[PDB]
């Protein structure tokens, strides 16, 4: 009583989920220091 383990299990019934389904939510957090960028997309570096 008044002493509960603070964790619970979701479950995700196989097909009973309309808003009750596993949604593997990957989140990208884009961190820039105005430093050397390092992860940037496929641009062709033309001459200067």
């Amino acid at each position: 009583f008044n002493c509960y383990f603070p964790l619970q299990s979701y479950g995700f019934q196989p097909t009973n989920g309309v808003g009750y389904q596993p949604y593997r939510v990957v989140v990208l957090s884009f961190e820039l220091l105005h430093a050397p960028a390092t992860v940037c997309g496929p641009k062709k570096s033309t001459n200067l």
Partner: antibody
Amino acid sequence: QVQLVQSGAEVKKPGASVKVSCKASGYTFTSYYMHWVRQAPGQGLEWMGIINPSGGSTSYAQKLQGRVTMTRDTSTSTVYMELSSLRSEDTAVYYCARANHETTMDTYYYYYYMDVWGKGTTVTVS
Amino acid sequence: QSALTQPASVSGSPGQSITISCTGTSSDVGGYKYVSWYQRHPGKAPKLMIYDVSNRPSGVSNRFSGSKSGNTASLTISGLQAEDEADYYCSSYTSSSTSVVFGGGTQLTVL
């Protein structure tokens, strides 16, 4: 009188397939799950997999690939248990088990509470 | 995971209290709150007394209590009798390949 009944015992030799039933009584057959536990000789109790009376969706233990297919009958409230390519250790007492909550929408309570039981049904394979 | 660890056999006396240990993995007992115990009267069916570690079905005598810490689950029988002599199996949900694990079992012999 909510009670679960399988068939009698079976006597198999290796490589066959076996048919185990389990009828239900005293409740709404489409609400709870049907869990299945055996007892290998000398080692403890062992769950296969389950089937939903609402839709028939199946699943089972990885160690039991292709050697098990669980079927059911809503009209007679009977659920059926299959085990092919039988081996010597398949000698076990096979139980049918009912989940301790009704299938509920948007649910939280987990559906592996094993609370309602069959008499038991021993398999003999040699 | 693998089968849980239970004592092979524990003896005692009527009215005295005996406790039964159940060790597993952090993925068997320590990650979850889902420990349930069972008993075997010889030649009979299982019977559930323990589930939700310390919670109970209706009709189980207040003599049996369950406890939880670390990798250890435990069952305590207060006010023992020859009425209590049976086999005892702890059960838990696992966060791995399987879903349910059982202990090796414990025979409680009343002397």
